[PDB]
Structure formats: C-alpha cells, structure tokens
Amino acid sequence: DKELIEYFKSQMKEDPDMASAVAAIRTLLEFLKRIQGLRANLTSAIETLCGVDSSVAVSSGGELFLRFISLASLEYSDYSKCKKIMIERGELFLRRISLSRNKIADLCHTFIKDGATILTHAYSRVVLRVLEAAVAAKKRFSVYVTESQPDLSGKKMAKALCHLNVPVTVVLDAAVGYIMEKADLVIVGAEGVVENGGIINKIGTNQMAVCAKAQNKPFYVVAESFKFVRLFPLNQQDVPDKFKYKALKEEHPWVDYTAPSLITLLFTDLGVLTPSAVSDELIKLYL
C-alpha cells in the first residue's frame, strides 16, 4: 500500500526511457502478484498511483489494465486459477506494449519527406523514436523544438536529439507562430487521447495546432495504445484538474486539450488513425 509507491518510483529510477503508464502497469502487475475484492485492491492501486503522478497516461494506462484483466474474468471465474490466468494475460499485455514505440516509428517515419523541417513540442520519447527511425532510414531533416516552459523539456529533447546528428533548434516558447511557416509538418506526442480523437499534451500543444491549421501544416500525433483515455472535453475547462495541475498570481496548467479538427493523423500503436477512427478504437477497448 506504501511499498507500491516506492516500487513505482523505482521503476522510474532504473528505467527513465520507460513510459509512466508502463511503470504503472509493471508496479500494478507486481501488486497483482501479491476473487472480486482483488479488483477493488487494483482500483485502490489506480487511485494511489494516479495520486502521485496525475498524468493522463497513468490513470488511463492503468485503467485499461483494470479492464484487460477483467475481460478475462468475463470468460471464467475462479479464486486462484483466475489469478494465474490474470498474470499470464497481463504479462502478454505488458510485453505487447514494449513494442509500441517501434511500431509507431515504423508507421510515422515514412511520413517525413527527405529534406523536411519538422516542428515538435516539449519532449516525447515517441517523437524522439520517430526521428531516430527516420534518420536510420537515411532521411535528413531539420527539427524545431519549443523549449516549453516551465520545466524546459525542449532543451532536454534537443540535447537528446543532437546525438542523432540532426540540425535541431530550440525555438522560444512564444515563437511557434513565427517559425510555423518554416515547418513542413508538426509531430507531437500525446499524453492522452480523448474520446473524440483529440489529444491532451503538455501546455502549448493547442496553440501549436491552431497555428498549424492556420497555415495548413499537417499536425501529426504519435501516441500509444494505452494512452486512449475515455474523457470527452469540449473546452479547456473540461479537462479535469487532476491532470492539469501537478501540485501577480501564476496559473500554470500543465496540459491542454487539442481539438480533433486540428489533428491531421494519429500514429498510434494500433495503426495510423484518422482522428475519427480513435473513437471506434476506444469503443473497442471498452466494449
């Protein structure tokens, strides 16, 4: 109950490249290794894990795991046989999302023209993998990255992407509308994909998209399958205060909702998706 948080922090420690939701899956799966009250224990694990990270991916990635195991309980019921079919099905789920970023990269790196000049937001381990696969296919391009206050993740990305021998420019956070005509396409990594096909990414993604549709630059999103959250925002207030805030007055939301009309395509795990297509998949991921 408290060692759960410690193990989750450890999965952050010895694996920074592993996603937050995957860390939640691993620590929750180990907690599963320790009838119907066990579903309540896993729901409590969801609450305690979302209470310390508050990303959309954690409360969605763990929430599919509350459903990917409870789908097997619809097939059969037991007391310890059900726990072992739970662990051999959860291990399959966990090893089926260790291959997510590679599949996204294989789908998305074919959308970058040679000699292109992309624009990306703060820091995505998926956008980084899309560009890593794009330079491994002998494409050459330029990357514009916004520094993306307050945590300056854009500088972390450009330091993590200069090793790939790519011309990367840490543009100012305010200057998206300036360099937006210098961009062939926009690749961002969603922190959660809501039910209408729009995304929830770090603050400033929305005005990256609104500028994009102002100049008809394609706005590509590279999310994963477990980031499909069941929310349906209609404006920026409809995003819950769980997700927006990690904690002369400062405001500081950390995420904002991007409308699905602004998004050209989503390169999720389960194939390239129109923003409409996402909704179907969400239905399929929750019957």
Partner 1 sequence: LFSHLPQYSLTQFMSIPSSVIHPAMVRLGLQYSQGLVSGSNARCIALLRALQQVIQDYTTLSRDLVNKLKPYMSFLTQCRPLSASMHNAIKFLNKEITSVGSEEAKSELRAAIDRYVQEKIVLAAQAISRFAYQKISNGDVILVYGCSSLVSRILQEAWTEGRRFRVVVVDSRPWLEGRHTLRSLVHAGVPASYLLIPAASYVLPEVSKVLLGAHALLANGSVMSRVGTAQLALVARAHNVPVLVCCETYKFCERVQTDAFVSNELDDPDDLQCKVALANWQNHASLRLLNLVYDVTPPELVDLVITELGMIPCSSVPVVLRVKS
Q: The dihedral of CA 79, 85, 91, 94: what is its sign?
A: negative
Give which of partner 1, ligand F6P, none residue 181 binds (C-beta under 5 to 8 Å, depending on kind): partner 1
Please identify which residue in 100, 153, 196, 225 interacts with ligand F6P, judged by CB under 6 A: 153
Alpha helices of 54-136 — where are they, by DSSP H?
56-68, 70-75, 81-95, 100-108, 127-136
Give which of ligand F6P, partner 1, none residue 215 binds (C-beta under 5 to 8 Å, depending on kind): partner 1
Q: Which of 66, 76, 87 is nearest to 21 (CA)?
A: 66
Nearer to ligand F6P by Cβ, of 126 and 285: the residue is 126
For residue 172, what are its two tokens?
């100012």
At closest approach, how far in Å is the CB of 193 from ligand F6P? Answer: 11
Residue 129 interacting with ligand F6P (CB under 6 A): no
Q: Which of residues 180-209 bind ligand F6P (CB under 6 A)?
A: 188-189, 191, 201-202
At closest approach, how far in Å is the CB of 264 from partner 1? Answer: 15
The beta-carbon contacts of 23-29 under 8 Å, at least 24 apart in sequence, are 24/49, 24/53, 24/58, 24/61, 24/62, 24/65, 25/61, 25/62, 25/65, 25/90, 25/93, 25/94, 25/97, 25/226, 26/94, 28/4, 28/62, 28/65, 29/65, 29/87, 29/90, 29/91, 29/94
Nearer to partner 1 by Cβ, of 14 and 181: the residue is 181
Residue 122 interacting with ligand F6P (CB under 6 A): yes
Instruction: From 71-79, 108-116, 119-127, 242-250, give the range in contact with ligand F6P by CB under 6 A.
Output: 119-127
Please identify which residue in 36, 80, 165, 216 interacts with partner 1, judged by CB under 8 A: 216
The bridge status of strand 199-202 relative to strand 192-193 is: antiparallel
Please identify which residue in 19, 42, 97, 265 interacts with ligand F6P, judged by CB under 6 A: 19
> Which H helix or E strand runs over 20?
helix 20-32
Residue 215 interacting with partner 1 (CB under 8 A): yes
Judged by CB under 6 A, how many residues of this single chain contact ligand F6P? 13
At closest approach, how far in Å is the CB of 135 from ligand F6P? Answer: 18
Residue ranges binding partner 1 (CB under 8 A): 181, 215-216
